[PDB]
Design a protein around this ligand. Sequence first.
Ligand SMILES: Nc1nc2c(ncn2[C@@H]2O[C@H](COP(=O)(O)OP(=O)(O)NP(=O)(O)O)[C@@H](O)[C@H]2O)c(=O)[nH]1
Ligand SMILES: [Ca+2]
Ligand SMILES: [Mg+2]
Ligand SMILES: [Mg+2]
Length: 158
Amino acid sequence: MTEYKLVVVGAGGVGKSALTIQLIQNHFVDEYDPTIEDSYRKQVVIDGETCLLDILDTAGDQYMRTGEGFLCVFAINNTKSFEDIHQYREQIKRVKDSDDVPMVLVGNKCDLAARTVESRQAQDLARSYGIPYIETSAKTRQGVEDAFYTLVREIRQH
Ligand SMILES: Nc1nc2c(ncn2[C@@H]2O[C@H](COP(=O)(O)OP(=O)(O)NP(=O)(O)O)[C@@H](O)[C@H]2O)c(=O)[nH]1
Ligand SMILES: [Ca+2]
Ligand SMILES: [Mg+2]
Ligand SMILES: [Mg+2]
């Protein structure tokens, strides 16, 4: 079957681990245990295709080198995390030595009310990169499968 190597990156505390764990294990991690480097693997059917997903959960270059697609995550209630997305874009360019890498911009914690990053603002950034913008909530599961599955579909268009 086809294996897809996905990598989740972004500032500390934006919800990278919670997103990955919600997708793979179907539960919300409420506590905040900073990640060093973890990996998850699971078989799922996407668009009729049985897929093996290998997901690298990073801390907010070597281990990311094999990544085929990246989720660049920021939190909608953390303006600085949005402003620093370029740092992760730069790292991905360095590790893959390419300006054409499958990616999805993710605005997480959309269930929270203290929003400082408006959807339109993120849409404009995603448009400049030529990638989709999807909002998610690791807490309610909103958009979680959509974000990861869309990344797979982006890798397919590659
Ligand atoms: N309300 C809400 N809280 C969230 C959401 N995603 C994550 N959190 C909370 O935010 C905190 C940090 O989440 P975590 O997944 O550990 O973030 P991280 O990006 O993986 N951190 P690190 O880079 O240090 O590894 C946790 O207390 C977690 O419950 C979300 O969608 N909604
Ligand atoms: Ca703990
Ligand atoms: Mg983490
Ligand atoms: Mg503003």
